[PDB]
RNA sequence: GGAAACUCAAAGAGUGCUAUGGUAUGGUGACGGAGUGCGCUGGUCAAGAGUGUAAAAGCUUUUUGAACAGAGAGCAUUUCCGGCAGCAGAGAUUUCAGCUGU
């Protein structure tokens, strides 16, 4: 039997752990009968990931007791013998066995990754790379594993090339969830922000732009639109032109709501050229979307983008020097909108007035602003 | 080599010690 | 050497890694022919390394038509590029076992370092994983495979015949 | 090499080492040409403005009172430096510190046991020279009941271990 | 690598009362390395041993151990062991010869009158209660609870699990002692005739008939080590027998008078024989020395038994008396009955009990538990003897928790590896060797009157 | 013959269950981690060589070199760490991350 093999693999560490005079024979027999129970429950039939988890918790508890007893008996913090790594190696092998048997519970896979990362200097980052590789092989569609893999290899190791490779491979696998798109534009903005801040720092002590984020923004719009028109209206295109235009309108609503979220969490990256990097998404949304977002319905979205293009310089604090510089730009925007619109004219006028009043002695310059926007 | 309370707590976990269990079964005396 | 195995199925694509080769010369014998019926010995041959599930019945029907007419789709390209090692194209290609001798040319057109085998050894490896199915996958798919088979068969047939509900 | 193959306890017949190719990783590109539209877009932008980070290696490969006073710019450069930059910084600190420091009661019958002189061998078999050697070979049972599981496996694994379905090639040595 | 308990796991070898071959030299070096590794790793299993042996220890100098009462044990130990300490009061049929299965799961009692009952003594399940109205003498299980052999008025009969008669043996004319050899599948039979008969239970074939030539067989025991039979005669002579040689392998002069009982240790090292001359005698078996001679017992010891942990249970009628560490070489292990003035070098009884009404028929320790089953005139009594059983059995030799499927497959497997009756020798390790003829060196075929001095030439 | 069952046994057939060590964990300080050097993989370019030819082109090449892209799949050895504080930093009172000397 293989429980016999594993149990007698456990004996040299307790040889060493009895020789180093911290445990006695009668208590190490007790930890062996508990470990016998656990090994038999592991490699018998009807096994459970809770059996694996309880074995890992028991082995961590006897490791903590071993460390406590070592500090109290020998008054060293490690005996530099077999019995201080064998038990963590055992926990790692219980994790490997469990993930080979039940490779379906991401709770257990993430407990494996957490213990392997928190093992510290003693583990190897290529050993973490191996279990990231096989986990991403088994779950390519689950996207938080791609985010966690790239987050470990950028926010700990700062490996930009491999992080870009992870994000491009994940976007190859599931180019359908917008969350991976948003985390990729987030990673690219974080990388370019660290690039220009190390430039600023080398200047203060002693070309490559957000156009990467704009290009992945562009392919984000194109492929998310393609995958929504392929996901809905699923089997066939058996739908008349009313249902086809209803579908295409709804995909425009979907994609434009995601770009609204993109600008909403795009504004807080204010260390690069945030005006240019928001204005390029503005000009990428301003063009035609093949179903007349401006010249027909989604006119509310056209008014939303017009309000964004108006306040895109007026994204400011109550110190309104930019307003005193270019509020005539907002007035010309309201005039150019009300020169064409019918109820969106009154809506945009009242909305820009309410927005400027809410956002903006100090009340006397604000009395000038109220007389301006009255 | 003194004892320790945290050491004896997780030692009672690791060695599977029902000594406090039998102490509580003998102690609780149906007090309510 | 039959190193990897590609099993297409309605829930997605599976790449298996061949652990032990079956016998080539004794491949018609009684014990070799019924070891693929016994599951306790088939799991000595085949191990699952990857399973990319589909995005839904739309991508399922797209990949069913591409597998039917012998083309490599984009999800196939993704899973094969994730799983198969970057071997050489001139010396010792990596060996993938398929079940479709006219899908093989489409796989070498995309990955020149992959030689594809569909002869009787790859055929009975493939029908071993077809015979066991849900047991090899260790619990990692959504959806019952026969329920997805009913949906995909009806969708494939109505597509092939142009069934209009008008 | 013929002698060490004759003296080796176990021959694992994938003996010529198979040329292991680089593994199919999820940390890199397994084709090294842009494979998606995203990838070719990112690489044409990145070749308009390349990021091989030789500039970003030489930028952070520059940075007593440097030890005590600079406790803020040190943390700033620690957060700033990239992967190979931090590897070179660790190597520079290691080389700098290593350059800084160093009537009788028993009657046994002695008749011959003609029924079980067929359970003992007739003479001493070939490779041994005496029965002390030969019975020292037989003195330990290899059974499951008498050894541990690991010792049982070490005692019963055979010398020639082949793989069951692949070709065995002739041996090749490092330049004969 | 050192392993303080290796010499239990060591293995003796042949000695003459180094080599020039390179290949043979390295082969022998690998063999010695493998033997050392195997002994060390096999001896490291004592960590993995689950349970601990039982005991009872005095903790005072006023508290002797032989004056500890069975009710006091049953109060001091747990409810499962207290319920194992059974007592059946079967008054009307005769004194009950007791027998346990080789794992302690089944009990087989025989009344002297006719009452034979095979039962699961630890559940409440009997599976044969048959009243064979002629005087039965003894019984034993064969390889299971599924078959048992009973020695009746004359003929030995063999019954199945539920008690139907399978066989009436026309040989085995008057048995009084039956014992099964489980690795060899042999039912061994001796009694009022001076004959010893080995009968193969599997094939069905009478393997051996041997003239004891010493009258009726007074006692009989089996060496569990090497399966030779120690029979005790009316000469005071024990003789060790094998089914190959028609003469006894050894004849020992144990006692004066007859030999009332024989017991052998399970290690095959010590043998306790009680004679009718009020003499217990502890014998070395391997070297045939006489270790101890406890003469002048107060009344002749009618039974002896040896537990798996080496206790010695002697029974002298109403009394049962157990000694601990009595089967040892030193003279301080001679079993006494009192310590004259508190001598620590006197082996007083480990515990004693008095069956005040009756005279005990036989003794048998329950195999893997801490009990001694004594069968007497009014039935059965188990005694909680705390030092008296192997706490750590091996579950693939013989398992006390074995199921029906495990019984079936273990029956077929032990039937398949049944040892031939010719392999029974005085030492078990003598069937791999070479002859004690046929020279110990192998042979290389290369090795395969001044006038008369003148008159010489004539 | 019949009836009952949370009854006791003796057997037969089928089905279910990852039923998975092709030679068992990454590691008896004999160790691990970091880095370096050797080794290995892929494509590209250049050179060689063959073959072909008016010259070629092309094709072949277990021939070498170059920079590049890497794999974790090998091998050394004293290059450092698994020593101590002082100090700031990190995450949820425990663990984690670098400077000045022992």
From Swiss-Prot, chain B:
Q: Where in the cell is it found?
A: Nucleus, Nucleolus
Coiled coil, from the record: none
Q: Which domain of life is it from?
A: Eukaryota
Q: How does it assemble?
A: Interacts with snoRNA U3. Interacts with MPP10, UTP21 and UTP25. Component of the ribosomal small subunit (SSU) processome composed of at least 40 protein subunits and snoRNA U3.
Query: What is the recorded function of this protein according to its Swiss-Prot or TrEMBL entry?
Result: Involved in nucleolar processing of pre-18S ribosomal RNA and ribosome assembly.
- Family assignment from sequence similarity: Belongs to the WD repeat UTP18 family.
| The name this protein goes by in its record | U3 small nucleolar RNA-associated protein 18
**Organism whose genome encodes this protein:** Saccharomyces cerevisiae (strain ATCC 204508 / S288c)
Provide the organism lineage as a comma list. Eukaryota, Fungi, Dikarya, Ascomycota, Saccharomycotina
Q: What stretch of the whole protein does this chain cover?
A: 13 to 44 of 594
Swiss-Prot record, chain C:
Where can this protein be found? Nucleus, Nucleolus
Signal peptide region: none
> Anything else the record notes?
Present with 13500 molecules/cell in log phase SD medium.
Q: What does this protein do?
A: Required for 60S ribosomal subunit synthesis.
Whom does it interact with, and what assembly results? Interacts with NOP1 and NOP58. Component of the ribosomal small subunit (SSU) processome composed of at least 40 protein subunits and snoRNA U3.
Q: Which family does it belong to?
A: Belongs to the NOP5/NOP56 family.
Put simply, this protein is called: Nucleolar protein 56
Annotated source species: Saccharomyces cerevisiae (strain ATCC 204508 / S288c) (Baker's yeast)
From Swiss-Prot, chain D:
Ranges that cross the membrane: none
Q: Which residues form a coiled coil?
A: none
Q: Which domain of life is it from?
A: Eukaryota
* Location(s), subcellular: Nucleus, Nucleolus
The note filed under miscellaneous reads:
Present with 1470 molecules/cell in log phase SD medium.
Return the similarity comment: Belongs to the UTP14 family.
Q: What does this protein do?
A: Involved in nucleolar processing of pre-18S ribosomal RNA.
Tell me the subunit arrangement.
Answer: Interacts with snoRNA U3. Interacts with MPP10. Component of the ribosomal small subunit (SSU) processome composed of at least 40 protein subunits and snoRNA U3.
What is the name of this protein? U3 small nucleolar RNA-associated protein 14
Q: What is the lineage of its organism?
A: Eukaryota, Fungi, Dikarya, Ascomycota, Saccharomycotina
Q: Which part of the full protein does this chain span, and how long is the full protein?
A: 301 to 899 of 899
UniProtKB/Swiss-Prot annotation, chain E:
Compartments, as annotated in UniProt: Nucleus, Nucleolus
Q: Where is the composition biased (Basic and acidic residues)?
A: 1-11
Entry superkingdom: Eukaryota
Q: WD repeat ranges?
A: 90-131, 212-251, 254-293, 296-333
The record's section on InterPro entries has: BING4_C_dom, WD40/YVTN_repeat-like_dom_sf, WD40_repeat_CS, WD40_repeat_dom_sf, WD40_rpt, WDR46/Utp7
The record ties this protein, via SMART domains, to:
BING4CT, WD40
* Annotated keywords: Nucleus, Repeat, Ribonucleoprotein, Ribosome biogenesis, rRNA processing, WD repeat
Offer a single GO CC term for the protein. Answer: small-subunit processome
Its subunit composition reads: Interacts with snoRNA U3. Interacts with MPP10. Component of the ribosomal small subunit (SSU) processome composed of at least 40 protein subunits and snoRNA U3.
What is the protein name for this chain? Answer: U3 small nucleolar RNA-associated protein 7
């Amino acid at each position: 039997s293989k429980t016999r093999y594993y149990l007698e693999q456990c004996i040299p560490e307790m040889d060493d752990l009895v020789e180093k005079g911290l445990f006695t024979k009668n208590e190490v027999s007790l930890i062996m009968k508990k470990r016998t129970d656990f090994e038999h429950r592991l490699n018998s039939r009807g096994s459970s990931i809770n059996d694996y988890i309880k074995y890992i918790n028991y082995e961590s508890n006897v490791n903590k007791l071993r460390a406590k007893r070592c500090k109290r008996i020998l008054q060293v913090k490690k005996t530099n013998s077999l019995s201080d790594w064998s038990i963590q190696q055992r926990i790692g092998f219980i994790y490997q066995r469990g993930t080979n048997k039940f490779p379906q519970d991401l709770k257990f896979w993430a407990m494996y990754l957490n213990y392997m990362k928190a093992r510290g200097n003693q583990t190897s980052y290529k050993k973490i790379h191996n279990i990231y590789n096989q986990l991403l092989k088994l779950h390519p569609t689950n996207v938080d594993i791609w985010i966690s893999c790239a987050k470990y290899e950028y926010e700990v190791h700062a490996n930009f090339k491999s992080c870009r490779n992870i994000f491009q491979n994940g976007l190859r696998f599931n180019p359908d969830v917008p969350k991976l798109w948003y985390e990729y534009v987030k990673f690219e903005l974080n990388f370019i922000t660290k690039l220009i801040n190390r430039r600023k720092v080398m200047g203060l002590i002693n070309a490559l732009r957000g156009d990467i984020a704009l290009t992945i923004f562009d392919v984000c719009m194109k492929t998310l639109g393609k995958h929504y028109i392929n996901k809905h209206k699923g089997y066939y295109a058996i739908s008349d032109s009313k249902m086809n235009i209803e579908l295409n309108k709804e995909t425009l609503n979907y994609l434009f709501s995601e770009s609204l979220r993109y600008i909403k969490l795009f504004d807080e990256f204010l260390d690069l050229e945030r005006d240019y990097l928001i204005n390029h998404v503005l000009q990428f949304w301003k063009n035609d979307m093949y179903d007349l977002s401006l010249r027909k319905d989604l006119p509310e979205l056209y008014l939303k983008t017009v309000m964004i293009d108006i306040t895109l310089n007026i994204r400011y604090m109550p110190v309104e020097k930019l307003d005193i510089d270019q509020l005539q730009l907002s007035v010309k925007k309201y005039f150019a909108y009300i020169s064409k619109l019918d109820s969106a004219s009154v809506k945009s006028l009242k909305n820009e007035y309410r927005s400027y009043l809410q956002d903006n002695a100090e009340d006397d310059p604000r009395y000038k602003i109220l007389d301006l926007i009255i | 080599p003194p004892p320790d309370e945290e050491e004896q707590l997780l030692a009672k976990f690791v060695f599977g010690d029902t000594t406090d269990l039998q102490e509580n079964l003998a102690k609780f005396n149906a007090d309510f | 050497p039959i190193e990897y195995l590609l099993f297409e199925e309605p829930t997605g694509y599976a790449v298996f890694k061949v652990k032990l080769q079956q016998d080539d010369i004794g491949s018609r014998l009684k014990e070799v022919q019924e070891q693929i019926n016994d599951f306790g010995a088939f799991t000595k041959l085949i191990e699952l390394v990857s399973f990319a599930p589909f995005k839904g019945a739309a991508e399922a029907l797209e990949n069913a038509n591409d597998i039917s007419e012998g083309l490599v789709s984009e999800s196939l390209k993704a899973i094969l590029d994730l799983n198969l090692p970057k071997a050489s194209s001139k010396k010792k290609n990596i060996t993938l076992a398929i079940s479709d001798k006219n899908l093989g040319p489409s796989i070498k057109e995309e990955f020149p370092y992959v030689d594809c085998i569909s002869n009787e050894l790859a055929q009975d490896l493939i029908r071993g994983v077809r015979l066991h199915g849900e047991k090899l996958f260790k619990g990692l798919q959504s959806g019952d495979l026969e329920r997805a088979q009913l949906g995909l068969g009806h969708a494939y047939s109505r597509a092939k015949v142009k069934f209009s509900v008008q | 090499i013929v002698q060490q193959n004759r003296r080796a306890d176990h021959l694992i017949f994938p003996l010529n080492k198979p040329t292991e190719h680089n593994h199919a990783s999820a940390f890199t590109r397994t084709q090294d040409v842009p494979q998606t539209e995203l990838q070719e877009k990112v690489d044409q932008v990145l070749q308009e403005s390349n990021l091989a980070n030789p500039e970003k290696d030489s930028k952070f490969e520059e940075l007593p009172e440097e030890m005590r006073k600079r406790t803020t710019e040190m943390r700033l450069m620690r957060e700033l430096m990239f992967r190979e930059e931090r590897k070179a910084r660790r190597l520079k600190k290691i080389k700098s510190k290593t350059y800084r420091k160093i009537l009788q009661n028993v009657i046994i019958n002695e008749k011959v046991n003609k029924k079980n002189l067929k359970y003992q061998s007739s003479a001493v078999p070939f490779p041994f020279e005496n029965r002390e050697q030969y019975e020292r070979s037989l003195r330990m049972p290899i059974g499951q009941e008498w050894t541990s599981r690991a010792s049982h496996q070490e005692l019963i694994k055979p010398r020639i271990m082949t793989k069951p379905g692949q070709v065995i090639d002739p041996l090749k040595a490092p330049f004969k | 690598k050192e392993r303080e308990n290796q010499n239990k796991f060591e293995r003796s070898t042949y000695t003459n009362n180094q080599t020039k071959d390179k290949k043979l030299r390295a082969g022998l070096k690998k063999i010695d390395e493998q033997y050392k590794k195997a002994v060390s790793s096999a001896a490291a299993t004592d960590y993995l041993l689950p349970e601990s042996n039982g005991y009872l220890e005095p903790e005072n100098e006023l508290e002797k151990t032989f004056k500890v009462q069975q009710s006091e044990i049953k109060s001091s130990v747990d409810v499962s062991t207290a319920n194992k300490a059974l007592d059946l009061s079967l008054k009307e049929f005769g004194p009950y010869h007791i027998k346990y299965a080789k794992n302690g799961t089944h009990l087989l009692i025989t009344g002297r009158k006719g009452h034979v009952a095979s039962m699961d003594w630890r559940k409440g399940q009997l599976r044969a209660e048959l009243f064979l109205n002629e005087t039965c003498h003894s019984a034993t299980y064969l390889q299971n609870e599924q078959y048992f052999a009973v020695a009746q008025k004359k003929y030995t009969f063999i019954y199945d699990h539920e008690g139907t008669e399978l066989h009436r043996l026309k040989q085995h004319i008057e048995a009084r002692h039956l014992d099964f050899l489980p690795y060899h599948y042999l039912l061994v039979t001796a009694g009022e005739t001076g004959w010893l008969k080995y009968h193969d239970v599997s094939t069905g074939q009478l393997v051996s008939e041997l003239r004891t030539k010493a009258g009726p067989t007074m006692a009989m025991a089996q060496n569990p080590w090497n399966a030779v039979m120690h029979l005790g005669h009316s000469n005071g002579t024990v003789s060790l027998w094998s089914p190959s040689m028609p003469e006894p392998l050894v004849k020992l002069l144990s006692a004066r008078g007859p030999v009332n009982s024989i017991a052998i240790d399970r290690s095959g090292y010590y043998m306790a024989t009680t004679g009718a001359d009020r003499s217990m005698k502890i014998w070395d078996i391997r070297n045939f020395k006489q270790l101890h001679s406890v003469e002048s017992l107060p009344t002749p010891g009618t039974n002896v038994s040896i537990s798996d942990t080496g206790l010695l249970a002697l029974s002298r009628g109403p009394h049962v008396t157990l000694w601990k560490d009595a089967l040892k070489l030193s003279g301080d292990s001679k079993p006494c009955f009192g310590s004259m003035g508190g001598n620590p070098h006197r082996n007083t009884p480990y515990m004693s009990h008095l069956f005040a009404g009756n005279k005990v028929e036989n003794l048998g320790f329950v195999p893997f538990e801490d009990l001694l089953g004594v069968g007497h005139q009014t039935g059965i009594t188990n005694l909680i003897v705390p030092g008296a059983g192997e706490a750590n059995y091996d579950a693939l030799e013989l398992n006390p928790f074995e199921t029906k499927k495990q019984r079936q497959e273990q029956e077929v497997r032990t039937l398949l590896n049944k040892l031939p009756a010719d392999t029974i020798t005085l030492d078990p390790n003598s069937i791999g060797s070479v002859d004690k003829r046929s020279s110990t060196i192998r042979l290389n075929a290369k090795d395969l009157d001044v006038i008369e001095e003148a008159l010489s030439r004539f």
